[PDB]
Structure formats: C-alpha cells, structure tokens
Amino acid sequence: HIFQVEYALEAVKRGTCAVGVKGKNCVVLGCERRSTLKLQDTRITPSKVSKIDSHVVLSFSGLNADSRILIEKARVEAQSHRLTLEDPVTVEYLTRYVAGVQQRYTQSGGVRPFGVSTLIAGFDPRDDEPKLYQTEPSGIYSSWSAQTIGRNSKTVREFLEKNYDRKEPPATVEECVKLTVRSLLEVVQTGAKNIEITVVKPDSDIVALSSEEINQYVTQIEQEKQEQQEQD
C-alpha cells in the first residue's frame, strides 16, 4: 500500500545524488557528498560508493543508516555464494538478492521498507560486458545504460538524455569519467570536492579517484566550457 512505499521514494528524493554510466569497456559510479563541516574528521569520512566483492560495487541515495544494512547483507551473500557454489557472484544475482531483501521488508508489515535506492555495478566473472542496475525501495530492479537517483535526479536525467547515446557509449574510461563529472557538476554547484567517483574495469580492476584526479577533469571541463564561451 501507499502508506510507506510512495513515501520511501520521497525519502530517496531527499538523499544525495548518485549517477552511473556504462562505457564500452568500463562502468563509472559517481556520487554527490554533503559538504564536510568545520570540525569533521576528514581522514575517516566513508567512501559513499561501497565495494561488495572485488568486481561488484554499490552506491545509494536515501537513508545512510538503512544503506549500511543492505551493504552488509550484500557482502555476506557474495561470500556465501563463493563458499557454496565456488564462483564469484553475478551482478544480476547480487541485484536479485538486494532487491529481494528490500521486497521482504515491503510486504511483511511490522517492519518498514528500506528508505534507500541503490545503483549496483560490476562485471560478471570471466566476462567483458559492463553491468549497471537500480533497486527501488519497492524491490523493483532494472538494467540501465545510464541512470541517476537522489536530489535533482531529473536535471541529470535531462543532461544524460541530451549527451549520452546507448549505441555510441563513451569508448574510453576518460570520456566516461568526463561525462559523469559534467553530469555531477549540474547537481553539485560547489566544485570538485563534493564529487566522489569510482571506475570498474574487467578482471577486478576497481579504482576510486582522488580529489586531484577529479580536479583535473573539472579543470578540463571548465576550460573547455570557457573555450565555448570565449567563442561567441
């Protein structure tokens, strides 16, 4: 019934922006992080994009506290699958499991649904198709080429609908990063300190980007935008 599942989607609209796009050969998850307060401990500020297994990663929008329980459940199932089936989990199975636990907390009454929507990304073991998925608080889940959740998600969905094409995905990681940074900049009207980005490449190459690597993408974007305003 409406009386929590529509309203858990409203709590997902309050949470910070999370974006993902497929490249030809990689997937990049990007997220907005709220500005760190004057007395906050920066050296232990958690990564916002969370690794489930060496090939699989989850980003979220919604309640932080609810997200940490889904992330733990996803971590224990990926390892219990390896231990019992002797194979790394598929991104589809891990999504199926996360969507399943969100659905069990929606149907049952007594418990409330999880106030979190997740982007799940990775590559299946021994394979080269990048995979990207959404889960809703409803337990519905879907494959996407490019998607955004959280605050202002429709201004990114507009930007992606204008810039990104399923049949000409960005062919190189660096184009894929520039496209998600350009999209993130639309919602993060501050600089290169409020964006967090992580790249997955085949055979368990998962890389988080530092603020300096992010600032040189934002520096390129700013001076290309200024070339296209130094021109009339």
């Binding site: 329980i69 459940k73 069990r104 049952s108 007594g110 418990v111």
Partner: protein, 87 residues
C-alpha cells in the same frame, strides 16, 4: 558416537510441556491445551526485543517458573537476522 544423555536433554522442556498438554487434553478437553498455547503465543510474539537475552518475566508466570531454576538458567550458552527470524 554422541553422549547417551544428549538427545534427551536437547528437547527436555518441549517434551515435558507436550506431555503436560496431553494430560490437560485428556482431563479437561481441547480447551485447556488451546488456551495455554494461545497465551504462550502472545507472550513469545509480543515482547520481541533483539537484545533481551533473558526470556520474559511474565513467561515465568505462565510456565510455573517463579522458584524453580536449573542449569539452563545458570548457563544460558544480528538485529536484522532476529527481525527476519521473528517474521
């Protein structure tokens, strides 16, 4: 290979309460086992509290356990796991 006494004491409380509920069926009819089962449901169903290790105090007023203690009370031997197990 297991100890001769192990199986018997694994399920002593359930065996002794099943034997007693059969006597209340025999003497008083299906009403007495049914009423006492239904009270024990309310007390195990409500009070769900994933840190309260001791078991209920009112559950000691239904089992007839006010001055009767034993080694299971002396030697008693995840919140979302408990939520799902309850539901």
């Amino acid at each position: 290979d297991r100890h001769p006494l192990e199986s018997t004491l694994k399920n002593w409380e359930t065996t002794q309460r099943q034997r007693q509920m059969e006597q209340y069926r025999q003497i008083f009819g299906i009403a007495e086992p049914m009423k006492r089962t239904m009270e024990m449901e309310i007390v195990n169903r409500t009070d769900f509290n994933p840190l309260s290790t001791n078991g209920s105090i009112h559950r000691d007023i239904l089992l007839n356990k006010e001055c009767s203690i034993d080694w299971e009370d002396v030697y008693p031997g995840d919140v979302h796991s408990k939520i799902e197990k309850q539901l």
